Amino acid sequence: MEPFGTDERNWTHEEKDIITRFLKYDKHVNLKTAEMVYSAEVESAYFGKAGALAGGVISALFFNFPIVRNLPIIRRSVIGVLPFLYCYTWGKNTQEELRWLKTFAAYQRFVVYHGQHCKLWV
Amino acid sequence: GFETVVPAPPTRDDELRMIKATEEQFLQQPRYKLYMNEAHRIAKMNHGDRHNNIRAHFWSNFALGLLITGPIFIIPFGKAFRNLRSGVPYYFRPKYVFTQKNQYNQDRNWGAMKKQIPLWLGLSTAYAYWFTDFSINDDEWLEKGKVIYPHQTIKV
């Protein structure tokens, strides 16, 4: 449905949210696509929270590491927060990637259910 | 879209006239160009003559470009191989065989030739492709495909 091409603008975050919401409750979306979307939304939540918790855990140990023990407060805080940010970003990116990929797959399936793709003839 | 007036079935006289025209057209062909005698024989002969003229022009242009582009470009290009990039005279850097070039300027001559000969050939080919008109046989709309019979070719 959306434009395809290198020059075309990439799908936005708000657009992706709107598309996911439409696919979640549309009366013109098949039950298989709905179940796929629900399963995608359910399981993708654990990854981000788990990554954030892993960052919180690992960053605490890195705050009391051998060389981290006797550094100035600013450098110690920065070094400690460094692992937490990396792991939180990893978890959130993984969750968003899984959700958006499955959403795009569901969108393709719905377009197929309505034949909304050019040169797609059965 | 406008259609012409359809002629009626020709009589034996018109048939004989067409046969005579076809016979003359067939007898006119020299044996030096072996082209099959079919519906598209006439168009094939025409396209072949056009391509032959174009090829003669292209070969003449290639000769002219080889004669001209050399002394202007290749010969000065030789001055580029007179000395090495380091400023010293060109030294023979063997790749696999340590060939013994005992002649005076054998190394420089061989290197310059192996470099310039492809350069001269390519420059001549480019000049020929640039300064030769292929529009004589070129058909933007492919209009040359009309079939012409020997009967329509000549009138007796």
Partner: protein, 173 residues
């Protein structure tokens, strides 16, 4: 000013130029029933010319990558000995030069005839391009504005009554 001015694939300096990749992209938003015989012939000639040009395309970039790989190698020429490193560097560099070339517009008389055609075939082509390919259509319209080619579907039209469908870039009126 080559003598082969009547060549079907020949081109001028300031004619309509489109990026090679765009060409392939442009081939993704048309229907054969929408074209008349003239448009079909133009499209077939363009397809043949594009096949030959795309075949010859990376070869034109071949010297650039080989020189860059040698340039990226350093100040030593180990011909047929450093061949492995030179070949890996070329296999890396050539994709970049190829992308840069395929992203560069190239003027073509056939491209100008297919796009800027006063016929209904050209009208339909322009409309479908403006509809399905937003970025390509915007780039084509921007290029055409500097070429003083004014089509009704152009977004940078000063004689229009309906709001333009896309943002207009800074252009001298």
């Amino acid at each position: 000013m080559d003598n082969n001015y009547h060549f079907w694939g020949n081109g001028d300096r300031q004619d309509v130029s489109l990026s090679y990749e765009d060409y392939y992209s442009i081939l993704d938003c048309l229907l054969d029933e929408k074209l008349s015989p003239q448009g079909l012939m133009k499209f077939k000639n363009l397809h043949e010319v594009s096949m030959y040009g795309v075949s010859y395309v990376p070869l034109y970039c071949f010297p650039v990558a080989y020189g860059i790989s040698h340039m990226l190698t350093g100040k030593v020429r180990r011909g047929h000995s450093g061949y492995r490193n030179l070949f890996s560097l070329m296999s890396v560099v050539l994709p970049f030069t190829c992308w840069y070339a395929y992203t560069t517009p190239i003027p073509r008389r056939l491209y100008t005839e297919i796009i800027c055609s006063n016929n209904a075939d050209g009208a339909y082509v322009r409309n479908r391009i403006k509809q399905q390919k937003p970025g390509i259509w915007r780039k084509l319209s921007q290029q055409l504005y500097n070429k003083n080619f004014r089509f009704p579907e152009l977004n940078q039209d000063l004689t229009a009554t309906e709001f333009p469908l896309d943002y207009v870039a800074p252009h001298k009126f």
